[PDB]
Design a protein around this ligand. Structure first.
Ligand SMILES: [Mn+2]
Ligand SMILES: [Mn+2]
Ligand SMILES: [Mn+2]
Ligand SMILES: [Mn+2]
Lengths: 205, 205, 205, 205
């Protein structure tokens, strides 16, 4: 594994206790410093393992390692999107996107309001069985149309023609210390710290 | 939905705090009374929705409902197996199976010792990505041979030729409040409260 | 299993040899009379097995049978959609949808042309690994937006908010006798017998 | 991509028509020269795309490429195992393994006879939904115990502790031209040309 190929834990634009009372410092410290750090390490080790196996044409090891690449690679990708679409109330968290922005105009055209889109997303999040994510996505092929999708585990939006706009973590570790089994309460509460300014930038990028 | 079709939460043969210090009373209370209760209700609701859709030949609904049958039905089966293979130390929890038993003799012949089987099982548990279970299984068609398998979410040992001997819950709700992100500490801890008398009885049935 | 819950092979609105030179009579005869027939039988048997097991509250059998419900129920639904969106050239097969119809207006707004939408679908069909389908779908929640999706095996469009508009069978049995390994030639060829009038009715329904 | 990393189509130890009347020369010709060639080319293309994406830390592409590595790498491993465990009758195809061999002794001890194991394998094959494989496997951690498992599409026996002994292709391209929809006729016929000498050698390795 070379220095240019290795990934690192991203710097987070807000303090660990800044999402309170919606997401605790206790969850954020473990989520970033233990959970995200595990995917950073897992990806860098999986890449090192893969180059060694590929070089030897060990197709049995190559095949086995692919799953760890997908998982740790996806975990890093999902969590990085997550931290960037979260913001304290003081820093624009929970402020709806500007209705004149490309994203704001698209939400209005397809859903009528951000309120309805959030209801549709909370609905997808409730239906997730096990570990997974919900994403608000832009499709670059069908006129920049928005849709809400879910992925299992650390699976991500990897289709070249699709753009992740908002990423919501539904893994039990994302809410358990504060909400316990009451997953719908976390889903309802998170929107108060959602960074829609980042979502607008992602759409127009 | 007829009454004889409806499932119920089982009686657990130990107090909420009886598996301490290995599994907290806080975890068991939520695990039994919130988590397992949700699988009981979900299954009964899915069977009712299924019968209506099957009666109307509404195959689009039928196909959608089958996922909730699988998830909730599996959730009930898995947690029921789990409580039955958990026991307080004073009630034989953690006590290794009699080497003279059908299960005991099979463990010795295949793995040499219970400790080696536990080592294998803990490695399979460590490898679980996202929500899932590990099972020690008996295969009825290959000479009652044991193996260690894992399932995702609430998938269970449903094949008629396979018998679940030990079920270990690897979902984050099974350990998070006590062990947080340190899932290997939980997998190591659990064996101290595993009911091998139940596993011996499952092998012989 | 009752008489009202039983599914049957649908009547086909075209002669077996009427899709030639695009799809042969030889494929069509096996496709309808052996393949679709096997899903009709599989579903009716799975339903009979399900009522027996649900009644006995045999969660292990109930869980096992769900897979057969999904598969044969999906196979019947997918094939029924398929025959309805196929038509001889003499009966409107290959005729692009009317641009003033709700579907035609949506295609123009989102993709610019039917040809561009066909190119996107052919790209999705090319990327299917193993057995599966491609569908042009309408989403009732995001403003009636169209999208191209794939499913594996006999998985279908079962989400209540989604409508299958066009179903394209990519299983090897759908083309093998005529095209052999040359799967892209079949994908290119099938559009000449696609019934877009059925697609228009499905969108407006 | 470097030379040492590139895979090649293997030499097949029997003529295209050598397995007749069990597997036609038309099937073998396409299976080796079109189907397996597509896996060889696809894997080499995926390794090249992977190295470029890994080099520029483009994790979105990396995560997307992993599936093509798994599919093509698995496709090459599976077909290579397949040709090696196929033999013309005049070269010992269909001849049961020596009961004195390590494999032979293991079959007798677990299944009683090769015919009972074949029956078990044929039932697992019949149960495959869509594209997949059945494998007779040796587990190196539970006493070298044999079992029968199935994989979907081009998924393979990649776990380090498991050894594939016999691989059977259940994709429609493996039998369609000759057996059409009657897949059980193919599963029955294949055992007449299975190379058990290779299976014994795999077990002992
Ligand atoms: Mn997370
Ligand atoms: Mn649980
Ligand atoms: Mn078909
Ligand atoms: Mn093949």
């Amino acid at each position: 594994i070379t220095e240019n190929e290795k990934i690192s834990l991203p710097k987070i634009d807000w303090a660990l206790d800044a999402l309170e009372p919606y997401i605790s410092k206790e969850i954020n410290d473990l989520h970033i410093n233990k959970h995200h750090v595990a995917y950073v390490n897992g990806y860098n080790a999986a890449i090192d393992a893969l180059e060694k196996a590929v070089g030897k044409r060990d197709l049995k090891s190559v095949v086995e390692i692919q799953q760890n690449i997908k998982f740790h690679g996806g975990g890093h990708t999902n969590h990085s999107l997550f931290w960037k679409n979260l913001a304290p109330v003081s820093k624009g968290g929970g402020k709806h996107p500007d209705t004149s922005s490309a994203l704001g105009k698209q939400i209005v055209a397809q859903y009528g309001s951000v309120s309805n889109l959030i209801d549709i997303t909370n609905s997808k999040l409730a239906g997730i069985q096990g570990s997974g994510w919900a994403f608000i996505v832009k499709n670059k092929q069908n006129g920049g149309a928005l849709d809400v999708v879910t992925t299992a585990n650390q699976d991500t939006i990897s289709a070249p023609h699709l753009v992740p706009i908002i990423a919501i973590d539904a893994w039990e570790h994302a809410y358990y210390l504060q909400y316990q089994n009451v997953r719908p309460d976390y889903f309802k509460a998170i929107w108060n710290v959602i960074n829609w300014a980042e979502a607008e930038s992602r759409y127009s990028a």
